[PDB]
């Protein structure tokens, strides 16, 4: 998916902001200078600036915001790509958020829309046995259970996690042990949902976070 020039402009300036070249409260260089420094025309620059405004990173007057105050989950992939010095455990942070938030919305789904939850978990049957397929399945199951809670804001959170979460999963689910543990987990969730054993969701999800995390910790070493 080739980035067009306005996207490259936004990425380049966003990186500089997140990196601290432009501290909160500072002003970007004027258009003529900025476009010449980037080697772009000013029409493309203003398109890139539009993207930065939408990201919450700047305000046209361009004043630079504190990205830790204005950014949502939409910056997760950027923090990972930069391997930002402020979030050395970003990957671990994201898996911990997925685990702990999913204990909420999985329990809720089992009580509110168990028929939808079982429909989502059933997709684990007939998944292809390889990394990309499992990464997609796994995200779709957590996202589906988040919406099955009846509270679509959990689903919006999963949508925001999609990029970085599935990037992790595409690496993780190359391991056949990772795929087998996930299948066991989805099946156990389905069993819990079928029985109505809502009070067991917490331990099951916490245990899966722990066991998958041990496999992931070994695998992530081999990665940038």
- The binding site comprises 92, 96-100, 206, 212
How far apart are CB 160 and a copy of itself at their closest, in Å? 4
Q: What is the spatial distance between Cα 127 and Cα 142, in angstroms, rounded to a whole number? A: 15
Contacts (CB under 8 A) with a copy of itself, residues 85-144: 86-87, 90, 93-94, 96-97, 100-101, 104
Pick from 8, 51, 167, 188: which binds a copy of itself (CB under 8 A)?
51
The span of 1-9, 22-30, 32-40, 176-184 binding a copy of itself (CB under 8 A) equals 1-9
Element housing 168 (H / E): helix 152-172
CB count, 10 Å around CB of 87?
15
How far apart are CB 180 and a copy of itself at their closest, in Å? 27
Instruction: Rank residues 52 and 179 by Cβ distance to a copy of itself and give the closer one.
Output: 52
Which residues are annotated binding-site positions for CoA?
Answer: 92, 96-100, 206, 212
Cα three-residue angle 147-94-193, rounded to 5 degrees: 35
Q: What is the spatial distance between Cα 155 and Cα 146, in angstroms, rounded to a whole number? A: 5
Contacts (CB under 8 A) with a copy of itself, residues 143-202: 147, 151-157, 159-160
CB count, 10 Å around CB of 59?
13
Question: Please, which residues have CB within 8 angstroms of residue 214's CB and are 6 or more apart in sequence?
Answer: none
6: contact with a copy of itself by CB under 8 A: yes
Instruction: Rank residues 100 and 180 by Cβ distance to a copy of itself and give the closer one.
Output: 100
7 phi, psi to nearest 5 deg: -70, -40
3-class secondary-structure state, position 64: strand
Q: What is the spatial distance between Cα 28 and Cα 11, in angstroms, rounded to a whole number? A: 14
Q: Which parts of this chain interact with a copy of itself (CB under 8 A)?
A: 4, 6-7, 10, 43, 46-48, 50-51, 53-55, 60, 68-76, 86-87, 90, 93-94, 96-97, 100-101, 104, 147, 151-157, 159-160
């Amino acid at each position: 998916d080739r980035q067009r020039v306005d996207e490259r402009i936004a990425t380049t300036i966003a990186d500089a902001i997140l990196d601290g070249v432009f501290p909160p409260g500072s002003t970007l260089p004027p258009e003529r200078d900025l476009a010449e420094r980037l080697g772009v025309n000013r029409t493309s620059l203003r398109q890139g600036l539009a993207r930065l405004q939408q990201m919450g990173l700047i305000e046209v007057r361009s004043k630079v915001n504190n990205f830790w105050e204005t950014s949502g989950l939409n910056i997760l992939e950027t923090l990972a790509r930069l391997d930002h010095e402020s979030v050395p455990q970003l990957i671990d942070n994201l898996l911990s958020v997925r685990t702990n938030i999913s204990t909420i919305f999985i329990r809720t789904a089992f009580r509110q829309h168990p028929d939808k939850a079982q429909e989502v978990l059933a997709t684990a049957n007939e998944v292809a046995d390889h990394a990309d397929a499992f990464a997609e399945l796994d995200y779709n199951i957590f996202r589906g259970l988040a919406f099955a809670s009846g509270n679509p804001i959990y689903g919006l959170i999963l949508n925001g996690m999609k990029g970085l979460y599935t990037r992790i999963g595409r690496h993780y689910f190359a391991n056949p042990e990772a795929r087998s543990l996930a299948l066991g987990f989805y099946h156990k969730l389905s069993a819990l949902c079928s029985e109505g054993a809502h009070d067991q969701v917490y331990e099951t999800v916490r245990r899966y976070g722990h066991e998958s995390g041990e496999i992931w910790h070994r695998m992530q070493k081999n990665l940038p």
